[PDB]
Amino acid sequence: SPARLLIPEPRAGRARHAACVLLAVCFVVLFLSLAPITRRVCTQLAALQLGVLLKGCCCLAEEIFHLHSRHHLWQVLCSCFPPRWHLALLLVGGSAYLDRLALTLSCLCQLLVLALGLQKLSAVEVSELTESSKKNVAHGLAWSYYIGYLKVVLPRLKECMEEISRTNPMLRAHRDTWKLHILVPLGCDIWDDLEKADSNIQYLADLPETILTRAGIKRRVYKHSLYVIRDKDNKLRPCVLEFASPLQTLCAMSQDDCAAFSREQRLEQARLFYRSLRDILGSSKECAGLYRLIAYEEPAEPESHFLSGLILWHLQQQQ
Template sequence: MSGVMGEDSLVPRARSRLPVVCTGGLGLLTLLFAWLLDSDKFIERTGMIAFCITVERFIHSMCLFAEEGLFHSKQRYRGRINEIFQTCFRGHVILGMCAIFLMLKLQWSFSEEQWSTMALMCAVYLLLKCLGVLGPCPVEISEICEMKKMNVAHGLAWSFYIGYLKFVLPGTFLSPLHCETILELLLVRRLILLPLNAKVPFKPEEEDTNVVFQENLPELERDTAGVRKRSYKNSVYKIIQNNEAFSCVLEYATPLLTLYQMSHESSAGFGERERKQQVLLFYRTLSQILENSLECRNRYRLVLLNDEHTGDPHYLSREIIQHLKQQDGEIHMDHIQEPPNEVQPVPEEGPIGNINGALRANFPEDPVSSNPTLMFSQPQSLRSEPVETTDHFNQPNARRWD
C-alpha cells in the first residue's frame, strides 16, 4: 500500500513506445517522398542502402567478436564460441548477411560507381561508430537499463525485499500495549520512509522533535547466510501533533544509505542528479515488488519525503500523520443502512469465530439498532488454502443442492 502525495509529479513512469512509433511513421513518410522524387531507381537505391547498412553492422560485429574471442573467452564465456557469437551478432544481421549472400549467388550486380558509393558509406559509418557519434544517447541508455532491470535501484530494491521485508512485514504486528481495541491490534500501521535526498538520520527524533521513540517490538529471528538466529528488530514511535498522539512502526529504507554514500565517492561516478533519479526509481520498483507480493500486501505504507522543506522543523511529523490519517480513511468503513430481509451472518467456529466473539463481547449490538456489526477476521497469509465458512442463504425459496 503505497501512498504518496503528488506522486505523479515526482515518480517517473515507465517509458512508452512513442519514439518507436514516431520513428517508424517518419521513416515511411520519407520512403514515400523518395519514391515520388525518383520512382524508377527507388528499388535499386533502397537495395543498395540496405546492403550497405547490413555490411556495416556485420563488420562492427566482427570487431566485437575479435575482442571477446581473443581476450574474454575463458573469463566471461568459459571458452564457448557459440555464446560469444550470440552475444556479438544480432539476429537481423545474420539474416541480412544471408540475404546478401543469396543476392550475390543470383548474380545481382552493381556498377563500379555503386560499389564505390557503398564502400564510402561503410567507411563513414565505421569511423562515426568508432568516434562514438552513432552511440546511444543518455535517454536510450537509461531506457535500456530500466527495461533490463540493470539500474542500481533495481538491485537495491530487490535486495531490500528478499533479504528483509519479505520476512519482516508478514511477522510484524503492533504490541497490545499500543492498542486500545482489538481492531487496532489487527491493523498494522507500518511506515517506510524514503527521503528524496537519500539522507537517512540515525534517529527520527533528530529530524523532528514531535517524533518520540516508545520501545522496540519483540525481535524476529531466523537462520540466514550461515548466521544462526539472526535478529530483526523494529521500533514503535509516537507522533504528537496538537495534543494528539499517533503510534506506528516506523523506519527508513536502509538501502538509501548506500545511494547517499555512493554519491560522495568519486570512484562510483554517481552524482547528486543520478542519486535522486535512483531514489525515485527505487521507490517505483519497491512499490511494484511489494504490491505483487502476497505476503507483504496491505502491511506497509511507503512515504516519499520531499527534500525541499528546509526551515520546517515539524515537516516529518506532519507527513507521517497525514499518511496515517489517509490509511485510516482507506480502512474505515462507513455505516450503511441494512436492507430489509437481510440475512444474518452464521456464527463462525475456530480462531476467527473467537475473535468475532470477542468483538461482540466488547461492543454488544443494540437489538433496536439498524446498523450492522462489523466482523473482522484474523490476518492470514493470502496463500493459505481457502476454507468455506458460510452456508447457503437461508431464504425460503432458495434452491438447495444435495
C-alpha cells in the first residue's frame, strides 16, 4: 500500500493477567521469611470497602428527585449501587464482629476523598468507555439529521409558502403556523400516510418543487406535503407534517440480526435522540423559528383521534 495506514486496534484487556502475576509475586514474596495477620489483612480490606456504600447513599440522595421521571421504586435502590453490594456489608459486619476509632477514621477519610473528588478517571478509561459503547446512536442521528436535512430545507420554507399564500386566502389567514411540524413518537412506528393513521387528517396537495443544483447534472429535489386537519365545528386547519427519518433508522436497525438491538434500549435511544435534537435545534440561529417538533407515546386505550387532537393543540399554541 502506497499510503501506510496507522489505525488503532481494540485493547485486549490484558491488565487482568498482569495484575494476577504481580499478585502471585506478592504472595511468593510475603510467604517467604499467622492467622492474626490474615485477620488484620481482611479487616484492612473491609476498611476501604465501605466507601461504595457512602457513594451509593450520596447518589440516592441526588437521584431521589429523578426517581419519578426516570424510574417512576426498587429500581432506584438497585440502580444507585453496584449489584455486588452485599459483599461490603458482609465484610464490614465480620470486621465489627471480630473487633471504633479506626471505623470512624476510615469513614471520615473515605467521605473526604469523595467530597474532594481526587479519584477521577484517566485518559485510558474514558477512551475505553467511548470505544466500547457501540449503541450510542442518538447523537449521531441527531447531528446527521440536522446537518443533512434541516440546515438545508428549513430556511427556504416561508418564501416557498408565500407564493401559494398569494392565491390561496386560507393559507394567508393562518400566517402564524407556517412552520414545519416534526412528528417524533417515542416509540418507532411510522405510518405510511397520515390519512389512515387518523381519519381526521385530510391530504390536500404537495408544495411546489424545491430545486438545488449540484455540478449541473445532479439535482436535489425536495417535496413537502401540505395537509388539512379538521378541528371541531369551528374551521379547518392547514399544516405541513412529516415524521423523523432517524426513528425509521432505529426501527430498521432493531430488526437487523447482527445489530442485537432490543426494544428496551430502543426507547432510551429514541428519547435521547429527541432530547439531543431539541438541544441542538434550540441553539441554532438559521432555523430559529422555522420548526416545531411534537413528541408523544401511543396511548394504551386505542383512541381514534388522539394524534389529531395533539396536533390541534400544538397548532393552537402558536396563536
